[PDB]
Amino acid sequence: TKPFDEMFLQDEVIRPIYAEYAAWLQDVPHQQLESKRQEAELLFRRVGITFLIPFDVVPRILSASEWARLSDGAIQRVKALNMFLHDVYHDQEIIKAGIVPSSILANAQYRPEMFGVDVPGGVYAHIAGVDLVRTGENDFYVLEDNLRTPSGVSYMLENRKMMMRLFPELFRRYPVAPVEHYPQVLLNNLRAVAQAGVHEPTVVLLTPGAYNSAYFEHAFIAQQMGIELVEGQDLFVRNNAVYMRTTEGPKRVDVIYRRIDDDFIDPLSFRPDSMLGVPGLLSVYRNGGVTLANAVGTGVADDKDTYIYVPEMIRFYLGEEPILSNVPTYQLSKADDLKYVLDNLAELVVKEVQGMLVGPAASKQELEDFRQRILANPANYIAQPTLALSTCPTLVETGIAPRHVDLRPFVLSGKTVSLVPGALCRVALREGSLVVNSSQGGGTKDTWILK
Ligand SMILES: [Cl-]
Ligand SMILES: [Cl-]
Numbered sequence: 001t002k003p004f005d006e007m008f009l010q011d012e013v014i015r016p017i018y019a020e021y022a023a024w025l026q027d028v029p030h031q032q033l034e035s036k037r038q039e040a041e042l043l044f045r046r047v048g049i050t051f052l053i054p055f056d057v058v059p060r061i062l063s064a065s066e067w068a069r070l071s072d073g074a075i076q077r078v079k080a081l082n083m084f085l086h087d088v089y090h091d092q093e094i095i096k097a098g099i100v101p102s103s104i105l106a107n108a109q110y111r112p113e114m115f116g117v118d119v120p121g122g123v124y125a126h127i128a129g130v131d132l133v134r135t136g137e138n139d140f141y142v143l144e145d146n147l148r149t150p151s152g153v154s155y156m157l158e159n160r161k162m163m164m165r166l167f168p169e170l171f172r173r174y175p176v177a178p179v180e181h182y183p184q185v186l187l188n189n190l191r192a193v194a195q196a197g198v199h200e201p202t203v204v205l206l207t208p209g210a211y212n213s214a215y216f217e218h219a220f221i222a223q224q225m226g227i228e229l230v231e232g233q234d235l236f237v238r239n240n241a242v243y244m245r246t247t248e249g250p251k252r253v254d255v256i257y258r259r260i261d262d263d264f265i266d267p268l269s270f271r272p273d274s275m276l277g278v279p280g281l282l283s284v285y286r287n288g289g290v291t292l293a294n295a296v297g298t299g300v301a302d303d304k305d306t307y308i309y310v311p312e313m314i315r316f317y318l319g320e321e322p323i324l325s326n327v328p329t330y331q332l333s334k335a336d337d338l339k340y341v342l343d344n345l346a347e348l349v350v351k352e353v354q355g356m357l358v359g360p361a362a363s364k365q366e367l368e369d370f371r372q373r374i375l376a377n378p379a380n381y382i383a384q385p386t387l388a389l390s391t392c393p394t395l396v397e398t399g400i401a402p403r404h405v406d407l408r409p410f411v412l413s414g415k416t417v418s419l420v421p422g423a424l425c426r427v428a429l430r431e432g433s434l435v436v437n438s439s440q441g442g443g444t445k446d447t448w449i450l451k
């Protein structure tokens with residue numbers, strides 16, 4: 001019993017989807033792609049790379065039918081999440097029906113400033129990141145939802161550009177769907193959420209600035225879109241409108257793609273010490289003078305305590321059964337969950353909200369150590385059963401060996417809900433590791449969606 005591999009079947013048989021890649025790999029002149037060392041030599045000789053997050057040249061390939069199911073599943077989930085957000089800030093029908101407890105209103109991410117506020121098209125999460133894992137041929141799990149300021153598209157776009165630059169001949173052998181139109185699809189969706197009356201909306205990207213880890217992505221996506229990259233001080237509010245400062249005079253801003261947290265957008269309504277925001281911005285948004293994307297108060301839908309109700313949102317709002325499954329998740333802030341987790345620690349995966357323990361890959365000492373770490377602050381942890389995480393062929397020291405991967409596509413909601421046929425794929429390079437996170441042996445791959 002081994003974890004499902006994307007390339008190699010039950011025996012050493014190659015899955016039909018990877019046959020053409022295996023053929024190309026055999027024709028590769030000399031020992032150029034036989035192991036991690038030869039891959040690192042190829043990447044340096046051609047593109048001058050020295051391992052910045054590591055990159056693996058073996059793509060994560062998905063068929064047109066796998067993506068169609070995955071894509072239907074992600075759109076269904078995001079529609080229910082947006083309908084949930086409209087509901088919590090309006091009639092709260094799901095709470096009155098007893099499906100979601102009223103304790104959700106104790107969540108710090110629930111913004112009473114958004115109660116009764118109508119947002120253009122009822123869209124709260126204009127961009128939604130969905131973290132997915134595979135366990136079988138037709139088995140996918142949603143690990144987490146990302147509805148605040150989702151990131152990673154720059155790695156998705158650059159990884160494709162890198163693969164096309166290194167191996168153009170490989171793109172001739174596979175019918176790979178393109179991804180580079182993402183910024184223009186996003187810009188078109190932002191224009192569509194302009195307030196009622198606005199004919200040719202002005203769109204800007206509000207950034208915290210250079211001293212932010214994702215700043216390059218902010219500058220990159222704004223440049224790819226062809227819109228102004230602004231900081232708080234570049235904008236100002238007056239008479240229910242937001243203006244951008246220009247030498248020729250103030251230019252009205254209709255839509256702001258915010259890459260700043262709610263807490264920092266308006267010192268007159270939230271954190272008063274913030275220098276990232278725009279004073280009075282929340283009032284203009286609440287009174288229909290501007291659109292913020294993503295909306296203020298989306299955090300209540302992707303919080304660890306709300307995650308468990310997502311399958312029930314799909315049934316309640318859409319009258320459908322969930323296409324994608326949630327992962328059973330324990331919230332160590334709950335006494336029943338804390339009791340269970342500490343009693344079955346060697347069988348579970350424990351993660352901090354805002355460190356990670358792999359119970360089956362831990363000794364009695366490190367298990368007892370983590371037990372103390374948990375009890376020092378239990379509310380900062382969640383736990384899930386250890387899943388049979390799918391492996392993708394990855395170039396390692398010994399050669400081409402299976403390594404654990406995860407997938408992040410980006411759902412876009414404007415007047416329509418859609419996905420560009422691509423995703424950020426993260427790989428856990430170290431043997432036996434399930435840490436796809438770049439902090440401890442984590443890298444990226446290009447994700448190919450076949451036409
Ligand atoms: Cl961000
Ligand atoms: Cl369920």
Ligand SMILES: [Cl-]
Nearest residue numbers: 415416417418
């Ligand atoms: Cl739609």
